[PDB]
């Protein structure tokens, strides 16, 4: 049994990058002893000088491995046991490819189903045997170390004398390149390993050599104590006097729904505004009225503000370069926060949480509501298109939560200002090529060995759909009930609707079988009324309605139907989602799909039609929503139910009436004496 | 100016018949002096002997006229003025036909547009001139008086010497035969005359000679004081201790609706039953159960009773002969009352009123409800078929009321027993020929000069329709809603329905929008239930209904639809007539034609289906009629309206519930624990 205190791990690194520190944490997890060369071709020269101290130490086992692209998955005890089991005095890692000299592939011994060729990224042997190898180095730093070990190994006499071997079946070393299909994660309670399903082994050293850095990043999120079924993630903050100064950059590169809401939300972020500088690039002339309306509040709120409008003809890549460089060139910019207009931050502590994670680059996970689409990618295709990773759905669904090393992030991220100055000083981060600005940004950080972190440890927010947003309306957000229903409800559905639907005594019954509940917010009423007048073609003479009064005759109103303004599909959707469930609640036993042929807005004026004579409705039940204020906008009565001698004297603006349309509720519209009275009517289930 | 006290009217009559007395009343109306010969050919012999007393009375004007077929229409003053105007000493009446000797027509003077030939039924002249004519009679009673006067008149020398003339243009005498189209009634305030529109004259003497007795009967109902626009009829009773003994004869010669009702009505006639003998001839085996059920009550009610059933194979003519002869052969039968089963006597004083009119034969006017058809004819065709008289519609509509001399009566009449014994002693009154028994009866009385009187002075009753009465039912009267709606309502519609419909606080509201009103009588419920069980094919497994419960699913019942028993058309009629107007009253503003696809009788039993789970109705409103008694026939609850926490604990048998079918009135049928519970359901306006 070889003594673990006699095992020494040697690696080389010239800077404490995130990869090197990831390697050290995995080594410290298993209580390895690590000697790092070169911090304070050239690899062998450093190792050879290092080995002269251990030239006679037959009692020492030394494992040399890379650090930037290596994680440890097993204990020194298991490692020394497998080394003794190999019966070798210097065991090299094996791999699928023979390089740099492909011609030397013939000199290699036949291996069978295992890997045949040497890889100098990881080997383990006795100090004495290794010293006899590395002392034979008398070349220069530019020269190839892989060729040095390969030629020495291919020496048949030197191979048998020193007992050199290759770990053919990946018992100890696992090189990822050429063997991605062989490696799977093997989970335990508080530790994760890899398994080679080709040779049924549990390698100790995971080496992401060649073009497999992204696959190592993925494995490194678990191995050895990245994320565990019982302990969760092991490097995140988990459970959570001046805060750092932050440059907040907002980007509007396309017409975006609910932008006035996004701008107003900027005033609610729980981070001191005197410590935040706002940069806002708006590329859309359609959003110029929006930016202008809320700019006075933003200017008073934040420390400093700056707007770059559509007039400067800035492409998204140029605007993102400019905003990022403004932070880079300011020694007082400690953190850079890039937030796109289609990102809805439901968690107002997002900027704090991400800063406290203390990463170079970190994004809050944001997903399109009810779908898998989100602001990060788990994997890439060879030509850098989206590909779904093995754990992508688990992360989006938050089955596994933590801080994850991912190939792609977007729409919201926080970048350490020191990183922009020291490690990424160039201006062309998003620009400089024909590739997409968002992908050029991720590649720029990947090319410098900078991890892109993603946190789903909390609920941060969601992503608006902007794909096909019809801007040809007076209020386009009114037509967003399908694409962004969650945000459409927060803007247009009355705030106390859900409380009323859940009971809580909000629903009223002003007349016997007539119910009264809050439905539309004051903004929906104002925009719907405005949209009606913008059309302007109200009905008049020869207008016919589905009303029954004193026999087979019809009662008309000055009105506009939803079909005319192209809003029936949208209003029908509201009827299904909100009116329907309310009607089944208030009328136990009744079921409805909220069918409605007659949906229309009535206008009452003393100038034209001020009243509506007694009549019945061609409907099972009728929805009657007030659209403006009694007293402020109009005077005069509302609704009278003659058989019950009951009158809705004061209609509440956002609220709606629900009454039977036939037989029992002969109803009348009282004359409107001053101003203009607007209501929204639906004859449901005809 | 000739003195009216010098004018004497002479007529001949051997009995004081109704025609003779009619003539006398018209004569007494104008204060004529009438000498009747022959009371205590042969006509001339009596007149000739009479005239010998006045052979030298040049101061006397004598008018000889018939009496049985003559009515006077003018005053002696006007008569003497027109006689003086004629410039004649013996003026005969003129007519269109030359008889008995047609060959003598050539000897007559040419007359132009007037009548050319003599009629010996009426002449006026000086007593002296008449004596010189009548004294020339030396023949026998069998010989012809018309030929006697005609040959004397055609003597050219005697015609000029005595100044004989004919009333060519009907200035004084109007013979009806051959001039019916020339005669119209001329009305005044309190007197009616005739006018000859051919010659524009107002004749004094109306003579219904030849085959014109019926037309004289018609004229005689007005002239001179028969019926007047301001005085009304002048020989009727107008404004109304043992009563005379009466033989009441009832005839059932065809299947007749509501016969149990007719039989029970016999017990309510306001005439002492100890003075009435009942004869009942029933020809229908279908009515044998009816006669038997009510015979014990009839036997106890009347003085004596006698039934002649279908087993004696008696034709209607034979039965009517037998019943009439039973009265004729009994000196104690003072009046004979013949009442057919299709005659509904709404006036229980009918027998009194007709007896107090003091006529030989008199009928109460009875008409089919809402139609002109009635129990008398105003006119006849030459072959004795129905013809409409000039005043028929006025009499049926009771625009003119009185007691009218008519050619035909039926279905109800009162005959003086003395008339049957003295004036109509034969047995074959209705029988003895191939003519109809009802027409043979009228002809028999007409042939004896007996008037057939008809009284519309009061509202007496109506005539049931028996034309197509489908006897192939357990209760055929249930299907009489179309043919006899008035009588169908009295039997099957609840007695307090009309009072409830007119207000009076009978209608109740046991639950919020659920109304409760009396609809069906206890007899309708018992017969409808009995008719359902007689069919017996109640529904069971796979039975589907138009009920909505907890989604798109259907709730079944053990029931039978009206369509199955062939009663939908009849029940739909009841819905229109009675349910409809009630629904529009209780739901002001709602209009309905009472459409209903689902009409059915539900049966509840603990053995089978005792309850009905909560559900809605496929209807605007639902009619729910109880059909039996809670407690007596069944135990267990009725109807529960869940949204209102209201229960119809005790359903009233005849009553019905009216509630909305959709949205608001989720209702449930409580389990029936004992017995059998029947209800009638209609889903109106689906
Ligand atoms: C939703 O309900 C809340 C509470 O029931 C409403 O809040 C109140 O607003 C009125 C003024 O309109 C104040 O006088 C009360 O003091 C408030 N109550 C509370 C508890 O804050 C709120 O107005 C309702 N929403 C809308 C749109 O009216
Ligand atoms: C129709 O209404 C009358 C009066 O409202 C009902 O008559 C009463 O009958 C009950 C017995 O059922 C008696 O106790 C009362 O004294 C009666 N009142 C009068 C004023 O006579 C009659 O019952 C109703 N019709 C039906 C079929 O029930
Ligand atoms: C590593 O060593 C420390 C003491 O130096 C010990 O507490 C810990 O349990 C060790 N961990 C492992 C995995 O052996
Ligand atoms: C008939 O005579 C009586 C008196 O005898 C007289 O009262 C009556 O008015 C007369 N009627 C007519 C119509 O002359
Ligand atoms: O003005 C009202 O409140 C009555 C509305 C109504 O019944 C209708 O819109 O047809
Ligand atoms: O039994 C009752 O009264 C409920 C009747 C009902 O709702 C039905 O007949 O469908
Ligand atoms: Fe309309
Ligand atoms: Fe309406
Ligand atoms: Fe049924
Ligand atoms: Fe029902
Ligand atoms: Mn490497
Ligand atoms: Mn005569």
Curated annotation (Swiss-Prot), chains A, B:
Domain Fe2OG dioxygenase: 595-686
Binding site for Fe cation: 615, 617, 667
Protein name in UniProt: Multifunctional procollagen lysine hydroxylase and glycosyltransferase LH3
The protein's Enzyme Commission number: 1.14.11.4, 2.4.1.50, 2.4.1.66
Chief localisation class: endoplasmic reticulum
Protein's gene: PLOD3
Substitution effect: residue 177 to S: In BCARD; generates a new glycosylation site; decreases protein stability; strongly decreases lysyl hydroxylase activity and nearly abolishes glycosyltransferase activity
Recorded catalytic activity of this chain's protein: L-lysyl-[collagen] + 2-oxoglutarate + O2 = (5R)-5-hydroxy-L-lysyl-[collagen] + succinate + CO2; (5R)-5-hydroxy-L-lysyl-[collagen] + UDP-alpha-D-galactose = (5R)-5-O-(beta-D-galactosyl)-5-hydroxy-L-lysyl-[collagen] + UDP + H(+); (5R)-5-O-(beta-D-galactosyl)-5-hydroxy-L-lysyl-[collagen] + UDP-alpha-D-glucose = (5R)-5-O-[alpha-D-glucosyl-(1->2)-beta-D-galactosyl]-5-hydroxy-L-lysyl-[collagen] + UDP + H(+)
Residues at which UDP binds: 12-14, 66-68, 210-213
UniProt-reported outcome of changing residue 662 to N: Loss of dimerization. Loss of lysyl hydroxylase activity and no effect on glycosyltransferase activity
Consequence the record notes for mutating residue 162 to I: Reduced glucosyltransferase activity
Cysteine disulfide links: 233-236, 327-333, 511-646
Residues binding Mn(2+), per UniProt: 66, 69, 207
Regulation of catalytic or functional activity: Lysyl hydroxylase activity is strongly inhibited by imidazole.
GO terms, molecular function: iron ion binding; L-ascorbic acid binding; metal ion binding; procollagen galactosyltransferase activity; procollagen glucosyltransferase activity; procollagen-lysine 5-dioxygenase activity; small molecule binding
Top-rank lineage group of the source organism: Eukaryota
Native source species: Homo sapiens
InterPro entries named in the record: Collagen_mod_GT25 (IPR050757), IPNS-like_FE2OG_OXY (IPR044861), Nucleotide-diphossugar_trans (IPR029044), Oxoglu/Fe-dep_dioxygenase_dom (IPR005123), Pro_4_hyd_alph (IPR006620), Procol_lys_dOase (IPR001006)
Documented effect of changing residue 68 to A: Decreased lysyl hydroxylase and glycosyltransferase activity
Disease tied to this entry: BCARD syndrome: An autosomal recessive connective tissue disorder, secondary to lysyl hydroxylase 3 deficiency. It is characterized by congenital malformations severely affecting multiple tissues and organs. Clinical features include growth retardation, craniofacial dysmorphism, popliteal and cerebral aneurysm, cerebral arterial hemorrhage, skin blistering and easy bruisability, and osteopenia.
Region (Accessory region): 243-468
Listed cofactors: Fe(2+); L-ascorbate; Mn(2+)
Subunit (UniProt): Homodimer.
Domains: entry comment: The N-terminal domain mediates glycosyltransferase activity.
Region (Required for glycosyltransferase activity): 1-240
This protein's GO CC annotations: collagen-containing extracellular matrix; endoplasmic reticulum; endoplasmic reticulum lumen; endoplasmic reticulum membrane; extracellular exosome; extracellular space; Golgi apparatus; rough endoplasmic reticulum
